[PDB]
Amino acid sequence: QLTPTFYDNSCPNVSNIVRDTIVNELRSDPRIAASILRLHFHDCFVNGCDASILLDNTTSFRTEKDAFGNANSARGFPVIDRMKAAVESACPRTVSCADLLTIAAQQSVTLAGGPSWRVPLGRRDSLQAFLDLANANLPAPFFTLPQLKDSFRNVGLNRSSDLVALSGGHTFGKNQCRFIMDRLYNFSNTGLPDPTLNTTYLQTLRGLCPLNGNLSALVDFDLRTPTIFDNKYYVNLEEQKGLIQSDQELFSSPNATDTIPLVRSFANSTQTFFNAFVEAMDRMGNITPLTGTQGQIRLNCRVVNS
Ligand code: HEM
Ligand SMILES: [Ca+2]
Ligand SMILES: [Ca+2]
């Protein structure tokens, strides 16, 4: 089983080295904390948190980086390489890329103002990447609530609290216009905007994402505090200001009888949200890990050891 003290003897300063790397990177790229948290999410939803997403192409298997949910979207890979190199220097062949990414995600959340906790450790690295599985398992912004629930259950997260709390990752970070164009101009083939999108906010978003405009333009997930990890994400939902369809459905879907009270509870109390986020994060980080002698301790996160 995974344990928070896994490296307390072999690499006691691993978390500190990871933190320093992110602090430095944040000065030039304020979006990196959000990007790293997402990388961990995308790692865990595909064969578990085994650093499979970090592998590059080989002639025998395709990289998950070319999945619909990763291509021209996932980012921060060089930053992970940097901290890995620093950790390898401090503690040679000790910390797996899977664990490194998990610590990086937690430290990113904390640095952005979120809760602080010690993540379970002991994960090992995959011997292959899973592109098809990534295309099948990563949820999409246009998913209905039942589809979102299905996606989480598919990887082992049965609880609606898992879904509502982890969706809180959208309390910061960016989103491309491409993913909300339907909500703004032609939702579900009606030629009309998504009725669950606040009309005042609709105008603002249309100005940022005009029809026939730059689909790659970026917009903030949280209009209240764009880069701070807090519970404002849920306050937005209560006012019909969730950015993407999958955000707003947590509060407005006909199937939201179970998620609405969770959204409200997290919007009403930072402590309630933070506690639920840590609980859900650790549950996601516990998805089908390779442990013991399974897999390996990858030296270069981009390639399997040889
Ligand atoms: C519930 C289903 C989810 C859907 C459909 C979804 C969808 C998306 C989409 C469409 C983007 C924008 C990508 C781009 O513009 O390139 C994104 C970004 C992001 N997501 Fe989610 N997401 C989900 C769950 C999560 C979870 C569980 C986390 C983490 C706990 C997460 C963290 C993030 C972060 C932090 C960003 C910003 C990344 C950056 O700015 O680099 N997402 N997500
Ligand atoms: Ca994985
Ligand atoms: Ca925020």
Side-chain angles (χ1 to χ4, degrees), residues 31-42 45 69-76 109 138-143 148 151-152 157 162-179 215-219 221 229 233 244-247 250 277 281 284:
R31 180 187 180 191
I32 194 58
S35 302
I36 291 176
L37 171 62
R38 193 187 180 214
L39 288 182
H40 176 58
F41 156 44
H42 286 196
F45 265 56
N70 288 317
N72 188 36
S73 186
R75 64 192 297 283
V109 168
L138 297 177
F142 54 78
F143 274 16
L148 289 171
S151 182
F152 273 55
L157 299 171
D162 292 319
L163 174 62
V164 180
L166 290 171
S167 288
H170 292 164
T171 184
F172 65 174
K174 303 286 187 177
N175 168 79
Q176 296 177 63
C177 283
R178 186 193 319 293
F179 303 121
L215 301 184
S216 299
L218 304 174
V219 298
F221 261 104
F229 192 96
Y233 165 86
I244 57 177
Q245 172 176 352
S246 51
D247 285 334
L250 300 180
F277 187 75
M281 278 288 287
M284 177 180 76

Side-chain angles (χ1 to χ4, degrees), residues 7 19 50 92 137 140 178 252 300 303:
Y7 298 119
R19 178 175 174 289
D50 59 355
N137 291 6
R178 186 193 319 293
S252 309
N300 174 350
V303 301

Side-chain angles (χ1 to χ4, degrees), residues 122-196:
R123 308 176 187 71
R124 290 175 66 85
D125 301 328
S126 71
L127 304 169
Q128 63 196 324
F130 314 84
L131 175 53
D132 290 323
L133 195 59
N135 283 333
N137 291 6
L138 297 177
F142 54 78
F143 274 16
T144 58
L145 185 51
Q147 291 180 309
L148 289 171
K149 291 175 171 180
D150 283 353
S151 182
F152 273 55
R153 297 167 186 178
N154 176 62
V155 299
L157 299 171
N158 285 345
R159 311 171 188 185
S160 286
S161 54
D162 292 319
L163 174 62
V164 180
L166 290 171
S167 288
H170 292 164
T171 184
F172 65 174
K174 303 286 187 177
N175 168 79
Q176 296 177 63
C177 283
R178 186 193 319 293
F179 303 121
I180 60 173
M181 297 305 281
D182 63 322
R183 298 193 79 204
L184 308 181
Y185 310 102
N186 176 28
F187 194 65
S188 300
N189 300 291
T190 60
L192 297 175
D194 179 351
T196 65

